[PDB]
Design an enzyme around this catalytic site. Structure first.
Site, PDB file in Angstrom:
ATOM      1  NE  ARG A  69      37.324  24.491 -34.329  1.00 31.91           N
ATOM      2  CZ  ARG A  69      36.500  23.518 -33.939  1.00 31.91           C
ATOM      3  NH1 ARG A  69      35.263  23.397 -34.420  1.00 31.91           N
ATOM      4  NH2 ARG A  69      36.924  22.636 -33.035  1.00 31.91           N
ATOM      5  CB  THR A  70      29.923  25.425 -31.691  1.00 29.15           C
ATOM      6  OG1 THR A  70      30.655  24.216 -31.688  1.00 29.15           O
ATOM      7  CG2 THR A  70      28.427  25.134 -31.766  1.00 29.15           C
ATOM      8  CG  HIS A 114      27.981  19.226 -29.654  1.00 23.60           C
ATOM      9  ND1 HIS A 114      27.014  20.073 -30.176  1.00 23.60           N
ATOM     10  CD2 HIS A 114      29.202  19.725 -29.992  1.00 23.60           C
ATOM     11  CE1 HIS A 114      27.653  21.046 -30.816  1.00 23.60           C
ATOM     12  NE2 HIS A 114      28.968  20.872 -30.717  1.00 23.60           N
ATOM     13  CE  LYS A 163      27.024  28.740  -8.086  1.00 21.63           C
ATOM     14  NZ  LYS A 163      27.367  29.793  -7.119  1.00 21.63           N
ATOM     15  NE  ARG A 188      30.172  24.423 -24.700  1.00 21.66           N
ATOM     16  CZ  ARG A 188      30.468  23.488 -23.812  1.00 21.66           C
ATOM     17  NH1 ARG A 188      29.517  22.770 -23.226  1.00 21.66           N
ATOM     18  NH2 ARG A 188      31.743  23.325 -23.464  1.00 21.66           N
TER      19      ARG A 188
END
Ligand SMILES: [Ca+2]
Ligand SMILES: [Ca+2]
Lengths: 288, 288, 304
Positions: free
Chosen positions: B54-55, B129, B79, B100
């Site tokens: 959705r984001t 967020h 990493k 994200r």
């Protein structure tokens, strides 16, 4: 204004002969003269819940050829994904939703949640696949100059072959077509299709081999009974070999070289079909 | 140039009213008056190290609505070592990075290696967020006409729910607000939050049911206590039900039908809060 | 002239010095004055049958930088893919160009047989060819060194499986009087065929045991990662980088010397080097945009 404006496109069964004609005409119009900015400020969701590469790439290219932007996913596998809530949300971001979902009925269910955002079904479980039938029809019309009075042979798994079901149903919306069903006894064309033909007084017959019908067909529609180059010795000059794809052993590659091979061109026509659908659904005014 | 120009946007706490309000006004501008070609010559990277469907859809759409081009990945920067290098490379390609990353600290790290390329956090672990909070605030502002002197009820897991924390924190930056916390004892709102409310003289109180405050609430912020249409009988005409999503069982579908239901609209507001950040970060001044 | 118009770009072996030059010249051009719409109205397929994130993002950015539209897949596991032959047969009916990366050697070549009039650009073919890398490497050298002839070039690391150095070396050898230094593990040595090729052209080369021993003489220090995933089990010992470049090694570096690395790097380049004026691997990566842009532009635009 146009009859397809802001409509959902879920099943080929919702498209009338007029509707089909409309899409087909638009398709050719666009193929004749592109409209790279037709959908200039639109953003369209390309929601591939179940991956379907060819279809997705075809659909997205069509979007781009009309000037639209695209957002979406090519498979759910790796995503973070109720379908209902998923649709309610996406519906707030985009102008249209193109969706392919693993579960039959999904597309139809989505229309209940998209608000007035059109839903274009790109494959519903196995079930319905409107744009595949459209590009199939487009191809036939184009190659054949008509969608009436043709001899059409459908080979393969007719029992389970739904693109064949849909295409039979669509062709049956036209006049004077004659069908040939070539399948193994166990994978025959379902009664329900046969009944429908009968209801329209459309002639159909069964065959145990392509040999039997080769000389008479204009369209040889294949599904996964094997077609090899030599099999076409007596084909009609205008006969075209179609296949929704992919193929396997079913059509020998030596067929690719013959003037009958048209499965790739067929595929290439999904662009015009898709573009037509998108343009009519998203645009009020006609494709001058 | 605006105060957010070429700035990194990692946490909403980095933001000040002059900023929120700016972001908020900008989001409102764009909502009304879209700028299809604002970021025409920009290429933005959509870097979803961990799927957040959705984001990401929301963000890319925002990008497109502004005319920017998009490159990225939907799911995968395991990493710190290779991550820094990734950021180093990517930042030689794009104009901004939207990322994200499931490992807390990751977004801040990226900023160390992005050169002059702004980094926008789209979800850092399960913590920061910023865009979620901005979309919440915008939704509240949009539906309530203000951010102050509101009665706000927060319901669900107020313990482990970072969105609530931030929202509460942000809301606290405004005057005359009154909070209602409806959570199970094990999931209560954290003492530290309480204390900050105290520091500002902000009135709060705990409740066992939504029903008890229903008549006072302007904003009903749900998380996860099943909210049902019946609960809303006495709701204020202007009351809106919010939910950062996804929702499971905490909001009954019957609510969806009610005028109070605003979680879908709230999600849609994500497009404008995100466009507003992209715009402020990458465009000098968007004259309102 | 644009001898590259509509040409498939499968291998560097297929590209002449003039070709390379043309590509680099266009890249410089584009870098100086971008043509944000040169390819408006083209749709390009980005087919990463074998995922390759950095390379994919580079290529696609390039596309967008020219205004083209992009369609594609990031990996074949997240796809429904049916023969590659049929796949290309299909896609080539939709797109203006196909950028492909594939796990098998000769996949790009085979694509050319089925693409009709659609140019295929190889972004990596098995452990075979990777033309644009070589292009961005050359462009980088030429930009920092101001030339591609008469240079002292060291290649370090896994030279056995390092196709990029094999490629870079062939390209460089198309230029005049370059001098090479090969610093590799006994087991991950530069292949005979490349050596024989140099002899053939009377191009000087030498084997070295360390970077230090050549530091003072080199213009370009080209570092490589061990091709872990290609290593034989009788080579497992060679996994760890045998040569590590550290900032302290730069003390006697020529002033114009640049350290390159096609990326990604493992241990072979310590982080302390990153801040020195010699570090040029990120700049190099950035130049991938100009070289890729250049190649697309030439292949898809009649006139320069
Ligand atoms: Ca007729
Ligand atoms: Ca050709």
């Amino acid at each position: 204004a146009n009859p397809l404006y802001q409509k959902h496109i879920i099943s080929i069964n919702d498209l009338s002969r007029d509707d089909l004609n409309l899409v087909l005409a638009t398709a050719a119009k666009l193929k004749a003269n592109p409209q790279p900015e037709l959908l200039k400020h639109k953003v369209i969701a390309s929601c591939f819940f179940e991956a379907s590469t060819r279809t997705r790439l075809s659909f997205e290219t069509s979007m781009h050829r009309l000037g639209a932007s695209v957002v979406g996913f090519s498979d759910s596998a790796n995503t973070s994904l109720t379908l209902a809530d998923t649709i309610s949300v996406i519906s707030t971001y985009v102008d249209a939703i193109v969706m392919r979902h693993p579960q039959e009925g999904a597309a139809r269910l989505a229309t209940e949640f998209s608000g007035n955002v059109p839903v274009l079904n790109a494959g519903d479980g196995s079930n319905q696949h409107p744009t595949q039938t459209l590009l199939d029809l487009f191809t036939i019309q184009e190659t054949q100059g008509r969608l009436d009075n043709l001899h059409v042979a459908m080979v393969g798994d007719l029992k389970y072959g739904r693109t064949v079901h849909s295409l039979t149903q669509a062709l049956a919306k036209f006049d004077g077509n004659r069908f040939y069903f070539i399948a193994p006894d166990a994978l025959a064309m379902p009664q329900y299709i046969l009944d429908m033909l009968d209801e329209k007084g459309i002639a159909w017959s069964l065959h145990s081999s392509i040999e039997e019908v080769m000389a008479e067909v204009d369209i040889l529609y294949m599904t996964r009974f094997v077609l090899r180059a030599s099999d076409l010795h007596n084909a009609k000059a205008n006969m075209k070999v179609l296949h929704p794809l992919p193929r396997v052993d079913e059509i020998a590659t030596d067929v690719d070289k013959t003037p009958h091979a048209w499965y790739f061109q067929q595929a290439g026509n999904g662009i015009f079909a898709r573009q037509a659908l998108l343009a009519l659904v998203l645009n009020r005014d006609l494709v001058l």
